[PDB]
Structures are given as structure tokens and as C-alpha cells.
């Protein structure tokens, strides 16, 4: 079934690609803040509300990426429950989708939104150059797409790399303080040489295990039966995350996961609604 409210975003976050590192950090933090379930934090990190059951994805936000403070932005359509990128809007007004048949009126771009779809393998995230120019070039490539272009092998490859670039610099940045901090570290004033960088294996593991890391921290919040010890964090060595404090420093915003003894989908959504959440 088709998604609802794709063009009725709960909020819009906007970033000028030439703006400062501080403004980028502010931009990412604001996304996390607007996505949060105000009734559910873990170690003072925000947790997303659960995914709504019995309905197709009906909660969305937009990210607008601008080449400059005056320029028309590239609009991204992202789910507000799991931060999945599913759509982007080019300058001619065409909505492109990463899943065939998901967004009403949209045109399928020719490939999917998983890293296997985009790179061939999730192990290849360590090969993707990130930085200010890569961000700007990705915005240019996707924003300039027109409905009438004849797709080509090279153009699709360009489009894949552009989507991958944005997924990392927007979506994964939102999910992980490690990734957002890394990207913030690549952004400098014009007086500084152009810079680019690739993520290491720890961040790759984090990106490929968001649910696992979210669940691992959530488990530590479960109050024990009386007369027993608080659950201890189970290390995830591949992510470089051995303790709950490290997990908290790593997680930008947690995916909601039902863990034994914790909130259910229904109860967390009940608390979300009671706190004003939409
Ligand atoms: N369209 C997407 N946008 C952003 N992240 C995604 C997308 N699809 C998959 N992921 C990531 O891949 C993980 C596994 O997704 P799945 O294929 O649904 O099991 C998710 O938890 C996300 O971290």
C-alpha cells in the first residue's frame, strides 16, 4: 500500500551547503529534537516513537539542501519513524522515489535505497568520500534530474553515489553522533583547503547496526525484578562501543525497539501522544 502525507511533512529542516560547521551541527541536532518522543529518552538521548501499526508509512519530514542562501533547495522526503530516505524532488518538480509504487505520483529512480542497492555491499561504506564538495555535487546531481532525461549507465551511477552521499551526511548523521561529528569535522571556512574523508570501520559497523545498538542501550533501562542487578550493557566490539556511556555518546537518536521488559509499541505510542507527539 502507498505511503500517506509524503508532501505533508511534520517539519522541514534546511541546510545551506556552504554554511559553517556549527550551523551543520545545529541543523542535525534540530532534526533529532523534532523527531524525538518527548516521553521516552535513554541515557538522555532521544528515542524515536514506535512505527505506527496497521497503516502504511504516514509520518514524514522534509530536508531541504540549498546550494546557497538564495537558491532553490533539493527536497528530501524522509520517514519520521525510522529516518528512511524514500523520495527527492528535482528542480522541475518531479518527485523521485527509491521504492517502486511507494509515493503517490512519484517516478522510480531506477534503484533502491539500501547500501546493497547503492554500492553492491554494505561493506563498501568505507569507500564513500564525504565532505562539503561531495555534498554540493550530490545536491547538484539529484536536483538537476529531469523527468524527460534518457537514463544512462553513467548517470545512474552518478545518482547512486549522490544518494549514498546524502544518506551518510543527513540520515546517518542524524542517527549517530559519531557520523555527525565526523562530517562536522570536514566542514571548514573558505580560508581552509577543500577537505574530504571516509568513515572508518567502527562507524561502518554502527551505520550497519543502528537497531542493534539502539536495542543494546534500551535494555539497560529495564528496571530489574526486585533483589536483582541492573542489566549491564552488552559490548559491541565491532562498533567500538563497550559501555552504556559510550553507547550514549554514539547514538544521535535511537530507533524504537521492543526489548523484553521495556515499553511496547502500543505503550510508547500512548506516551508519545500524551506528550503532544504527532
Ligand atoms: N531508505 C533508507 N534510508 C535510510 N536508511 C536505510 C534505508 N533502508 C535501509 N536503511 C538502513 O538499513 C537498516 C536495515 O534496514 P532493513 O533493510 O529494513 O532491514 C535500517 O535500520 C537503516 O539503518
Swiss-Prot record:
Keyword Lipid metabolism appears in the UniProt entry: no
One protein family per Pfam: RIP
Annotated SUPFAM superfamilies: Ribosome inactivating proteins (RIP)
Localization in the cell: Cytoplasm
Catalysed reactions, semicolon-separated: Endohydrolysis of the N-glycosidic bond at one specific adenosine on the 28S rRNA
Keywords: Acetylation, Antimicrobial, Cytoplasm, Fungicide, Hydrolase, Plant defense, Protein synthesis inhibitor, Toxin
InterPro entries tied to this protein: Ribosome-inact_prot_sf (IPR036041), Ribosome_inactivat_1/2 (IPR017989), Ribosome_inactivat_prot (IPR001574), Ribosome_inactivat_prot_CS (IPR017988), Ribosome_inactivat_prot_sub1 (IPR016138), Ribosome_inactivat_prot_sub2 (IPR016139)
GO cellular component term of the entry, any: cytoplasm
Family membership: Belongs to the ribosome-inactivating protein family. Type 1 RIP subfamily.
Functional description taken from the UniProt entry: Inhibits the elongation phase of protein synthesis. It inactivates fungal ribosomes even more effectively than mammalian ribosomes and is thought to function as a constitutive antifungal agent in plants.
Protein name as it appears in the record: Protein synthesis inhibitor I
Organism: Hordeum vulgare
Lineage: Eukaryota, Viridiplantae, Streptophyta, Embryophyta, Tracheophyta
Gene designation per UniProt: RIP30
Amino acid at each position: 500500500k502507498m505511503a500517506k502525507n509524503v508532501d505533508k511533512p511534520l517539519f522541514t529542516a534546511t541546510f545551506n551547503v556552504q554554511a559553517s560547521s556549527a550551523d551543520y551541527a545545529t541543523f542535525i541536532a534540530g532534526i533529532r529534537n523534532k523527531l524525538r518522543n518527548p516521553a521516552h529518552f535513554s541515557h538522555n538521548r532521544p528515542v524515536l516513537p514506535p512505527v505506527e501499526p496497521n497503516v502504511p508509512p504516514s509520518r514524514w519530514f522534509h530536508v531541504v539542501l540549498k546550494a546557497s542562501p538564495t537558491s532553490a533547495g533539493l527536497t528530501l522526503a524522509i520517514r519520521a519513524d525510522n529516518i528512511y530516505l524514500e523520495g527527492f524532488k528535482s528542480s522541475d518538480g518531479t518527485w523521485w522515489e527509491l521504492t517502486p509504487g511507494l509515493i503517490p505520483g512519484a517516478t522510480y529512480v531506477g534503484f533502491g535505497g539500501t547500501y546493497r542497492d547503492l554500492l553492491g555491499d554494505t561493506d563498501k561504506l568505507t569507500n564513500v568520500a564525504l565532505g562539503r564538495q561531495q555534498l554540493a555535487d550530490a545536491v547538484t546531481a539529484l536536483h538537476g534530474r529531469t523527468k524527460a532525461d534518457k537514463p544512462s549507465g553513467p548517470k545512474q551511477q552518478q545518482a547512486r553515489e549522490a544518494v549514498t552521499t546524502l544518506l551518510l551526511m543527513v540520515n546517518e548523521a542524524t542517527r549517530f553522533q559519531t557520523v555527525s561529528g565526523f562530517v562536522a569535522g570536514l566542514l571548514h571556512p573558505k580560508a581552509v583547503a577543500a577537505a574530504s574523508g571516509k568513515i572508518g570501520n567502527e562507524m561502518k559497523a554502527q551505520v550497519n547496526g543502528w537497531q542493534d545498538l539502539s536495542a543494546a542501550l534500551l535494555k539497560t533501562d529495564v528496571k530489574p525484578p526486585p533483589g536483582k542487578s541492573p542489566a549491564k550493557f552488552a559490548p559491541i566490539e565491532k562498533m567500538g562501543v563497550r559501555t552504556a556511556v559510550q553507547a550514549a555518546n554514539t547514538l544521535g537518536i535511537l530507533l524504537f525497539v521492543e526489548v523484553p521488559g521495556g515499553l511496547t509499541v502500543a505503550k510508547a505510542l500512548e506516551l508519545f501522544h500524551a506528550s503532544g507527539g504527532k
